[PDB]
């Protein structure tokens, strides 16, 4: 573990004046010496990060100036990277459960590991997604440039895709409780939308839904015994 | 204790978070500021709905004045001054 303390001391010496590499160094040092689970380097204006302590399960590094990350330690379960300048992500560790990279510049994601449950990548530049893994519970990708979206795994409960360019929506799994679809290019909805739970919520405002689609929906959602989700669609 | 931002996924004490009336989504002060500052400067006011759920239904005039009157107090605390005064400017227009 002899490398780390000195790759950190050289890292501390090779930055710019705005970066708070000293506060960072101290936090890294205390985290390693005490073998802590969480590393918090947030809000230190850091432009790079060095090799990370290998035992951490949570990495919280939001609000820095990072364009890339070093390799991710193989036991991380939670990463908070919002508000950076990331152009990409390294290979994601198989332990990973939550990826929060909102407000970055990411053009494509790497492979999504099999245990991932929460993927939050709003305000990026993603044009396509990898296949969504089967344990996924939450997907936030609003404000990207997505032309299409992959099939949804059957435990997905929250889906947010406002302000994309999606033209066709894959069938929705019964797990789905909250689906934000505004300001896309949808012209129809999959019939699965009507089979979701009564407490579920679906927003399709700001989509060019066809006339036959709108008539169908107003016919059903106002019908006497309608027990499907609340569907918001404007005219 | 700790509650998760509906958009960015970051946890803050609920006392510190920001809720929106006519909706039930909690937003971190950061995503609340950036979304409404960007809507006020590069979009129109009707796009100034909840970033998490898309509610309230705008374009319906009965709710417009009442939505913005409630949201004003947290915009006053939340936004930088130039964006708060622009929000008032974009509202009387
Ligand atoms: Zn947030
Ligand atoms: Zn909401």
Largest CA distance in chain A: 72
B-chain CB neighbours of A162 within 8 Å are 51, 54
How far is the CA of A173 from the CAs of A91, A188, A211, in angstroms?
28, 17, 25
For residue A54, how many other CB atoms are within 10 A of its CB?
A: 14
Å resolution of this model? Answer: 2.8
Alpha-helical segments (H) within chain A: 4-13, 21-33, 211-221
Question: Are A120 and B53 within 8 A, CB to CB?
Answer: no
User: What is the bridge-based pairing of β-strands A178-180 and A158-160?
Assistant: parallel
Query: How many alpha carbons fall within 13 Å on the CB side of residue A72?
Result: 25
Alpha-helical segments (H) within A1-138: 4-13, 21-33
Q: Is A98 on the interface with B (CB under 8 A)?
A: yes
Chain B contacts to A (CB-CB under 8 A) = 7-10, 30-31, 34, 51-55, 57, 59
A-chain CB neighbours of B34 within 8 Å are 103, 123
Question: Are B7 and A100 within 8 A, CB to CB?
Answer: no
What element of type H or E holds B85?
A: helix B81-92
B-chain CB neighbours of A205 within 8 Å are 54, 57
Q: Is A100 on the interface with B (CB under 8 A)?
A: yes
Nearest one of B21, B53, B23 to B35, comparing CA atoms? B53
User: What is the bridge-based pairing of β-strands B11-13 and B2-4?
Assistant: antiparallel
What element of type H or E holds B89?
A: helix B81-92
Q: How was this structure determined?
A: X-ray
Provide CB contacts within 8 A for A136, sequence distance 6+: A112, A116, A117, A118, A119, A153, A155, A156
Q: B18-55 b/e with 16+ CB inside 10 Å = b?
A: bebeebebbbbebbbbbbbbbbbeeeebebbbbbbbbb
Closest residue on chain A to B8 (Cα):
A102
**What are the residue boundaries of the structural domains of chain A, listed by start?**
1-235
CA A155 to chain centre: 16
Residue contacts between A and B (CB atoms, under 8 Å): 51
- For residue A201, what are the β-bridge partners? A178, A230
């Amino acid at each position: 573990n002899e490398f780390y303390l000195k790759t950190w001391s050289e890292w501390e010496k090779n930055g710019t004046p705005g970066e708070q590499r000293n506060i960072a160094f101290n936090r890294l040092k205390i985290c390693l010496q005490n073998q802590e689970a969480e590393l918090n380097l947030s809000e230190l204006d850091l432009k790079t990060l060095p090799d990370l302590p290998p035992q951490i399960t949570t990495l919280e590094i939001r609000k820095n100036l990072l364009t890339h990350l070093p390799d991710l330690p193989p036991m991380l379960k939670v990463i908070h990277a919002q508000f950076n300048q990331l152009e990409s992500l390294p290979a994601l560790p198989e332990t990973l459960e939550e990826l929060n990279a909102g407000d970055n510049k990411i053009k494509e994601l790497p492979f999504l590991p099999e245990n991932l449950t929460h993927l939050r990548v709003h305000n990026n530049r993603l044009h396509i997604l990898p296949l969504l893994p089967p344990e996924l519970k939450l997907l936030v990708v609003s404000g990207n440039r997505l032309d299409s979206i992959p099939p949804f795994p059957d435990k997905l409960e929250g889906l947010a895709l406002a302000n994309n360019f999606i033209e066709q929506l894959p069938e929705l799994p019964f797990s789905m409780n909250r689906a934000v679809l505004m300001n896309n290019n949808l012209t129809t909805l999959p019939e699965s939308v009507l089979r979701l739970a009564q407490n579920a919520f679906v927003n399709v405002a700001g989509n060019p839904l066809s006339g036959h689609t709108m008539r169908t929906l107003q016919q059903i959602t106002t019908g006497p015994d309608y027990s499907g989700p609340r569907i918001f669609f404007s005219m | 204790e700790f509650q998760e931002c509906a958009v960015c996924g970051w946890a803050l004490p609920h006392n510190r978070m920001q809720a929106l009336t006519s909706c039930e989504c909690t937003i971190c002060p950061d995503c609340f500021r950036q979304h409404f500052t960007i809507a006020l400067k590069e979009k129109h006011i009707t796009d100034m709905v909840c970033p998490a759920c898309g509610r309230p239904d705008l374009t319906d005039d009965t709710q417009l004045l009442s939505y913005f009157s409630t949201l004003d107090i947290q915009l006053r605390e939340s936004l930088e001054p130039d964006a708060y005064a622009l929000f008032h400017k974009k509202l009387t227009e």
